[PDB]
């Protein structure tokens, strides 16, 4: 397939030409959403989610699809994200494999899947197309524009891009820009991927493809998500209880391996390119004549309030990168409220330790409400 | 070539026979190791060093070479490990691939290497070969055995073994098994071997070979010996100097500069064997496996012991150096426990001599 998109998805056509910041433009392209929560008369309480590199935009269950979202604990009646006050609107970042037109969409030009003739992907693409979707359903201002992880770079460079397009905004353990270690991480994952002979240079269509490389990708990168104290915590020293050479013999390894699979069956091998690459690259303060870098950004942007929180045992994007948003936005005038949270579940907190992630996110609505 | 030996190694041969914990036995095997300072007439002046994974055994530069040592700044005339006080013993791991006999080494069975036919290998072994070598040069008790990350649980299995051998110890960044963390990174090291087309189930031939998966093994594991915060500060985002989807950032090319550095002089299977083994150990398994490992450390003779980890060491925690301490302190030893703040992390004891220097010159003092 290559693409894995969700039974209730529903697509926002890009019109005409869709201009990508490094050259190029996408025809025929769309961004596939799902929402969740009535959007009431005023059309005043849409909260917009921007996903971190690999989920879709199921973020949470609802009677037509059931099947539980990648945020179900954060998103829903009477949750966090509260869908009885809010109309949660998440999007497939364009780039993505999930119903967004991405690497392994059809090119109209040629009738074949992009492979790497797909434009070179940017942040602020994925924060324009999400922007577009947003004032294609009718809505000229969200309460609210969430973002998490590379959703958290999405939602800066809309805020940067679209200023009059969100009141408020949160922001889950994002940064301005990447620091060396993640950029190190990510550069090796794709480079799982490349070195796998199975990738083809990208032509591997219906074919296998880097099966191997990708469940590595993902080894490194959930390695790389929760803190080394966790793991030694949570396995120990403990042997498979399944019971040839050099093969698994730690139950540590027979959880990564599991987990992998479920991404290698799922992702694109080249969207996946693509999307870490674009992460490296971004940066908020690098253009448009302004000046003052990320901090001098983040001043110029108008939102009302913002929630800002971190894991502090987060070592792709630490901690301090979120206080740095904070500070930024507060140097705008903006009420910010930061919140570091005491978690090991260092980058995948705002994921699973939903219960320390949650009632910071309520309390800030509470206020926006 | 298949083994990277010193030219000034110095060999002591292993009994036909040599039994490997596993199973299987070793014949016409050897150790590689070198030695720096002068042994007194009384042989009470000796200090056994147990490397970690990678090094040769030439830890200092000397007149027959003097190309610089993976430990040239902590071992020499009037440095912390002074060789104008001590007949220091570099011994090179069994299964590795720098003069000791391992994966590399010619099977004198068959003429050819004995690739993956080398006997599974264990840290007890390592322990043994090491424990002979000492014995063969006609010493019967050390002034002190070193052993820094892997070399920490080769000096334990040697402590717990051969209790008679060694007086005083200095246990750097080591453990008495290795936690979750670090058998994952391991095993993924190892799996971008394994992963590498050249690998041909360790029958590649001369030539590059698993190049590329020696690579990413040697950049992962750059990667998890520091502090990812040190590593932010050290590079930034400053791309690469010099002029689809390939590096662009300088601590890529960085990484990549060191690990064919590393890849040049290792051999792949070598590397597994090494690997797995420090996966594998377990000092409570020893001695009839009595209160576990903590029972393990009580029971050893040591009478004095220096222990120290760096506090930003994520494959060897701290918390591993201070059980150490525990346990030896709780049998009798008379422990220094010294966690060092520093952000090299697993390194620390190679690159931060200013810290790690100080306390071992201070500890070899009083042995002396």
Redesign the interface.
Known sequence: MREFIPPASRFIELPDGFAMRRGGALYGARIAYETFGSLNAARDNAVLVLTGLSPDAHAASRPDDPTPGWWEAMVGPGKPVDTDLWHVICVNSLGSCKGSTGPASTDPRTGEPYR?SFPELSIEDIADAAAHTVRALGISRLACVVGASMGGMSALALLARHPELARTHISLSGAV?????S???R??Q???I????GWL??HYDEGEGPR??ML?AR??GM?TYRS??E??C????TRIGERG??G???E??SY?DFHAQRFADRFDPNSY?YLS?AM?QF?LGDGGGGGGGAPGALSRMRVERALVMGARTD?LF?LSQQQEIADGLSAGGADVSFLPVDTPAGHDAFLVDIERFGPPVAKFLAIVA
Do not use: C, N, Y
């Open positions: 790497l820009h990447a620091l060396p270690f950029i190190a991480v550069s090796l794709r480079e799982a490349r070195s796998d002979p240079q990208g191997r490389g590595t080894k490194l390695m080394a104290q793991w030694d949570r396995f120990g020293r050479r050099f698994p013999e730690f540590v390894e990564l390119l690459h490296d940066d070592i630490p």
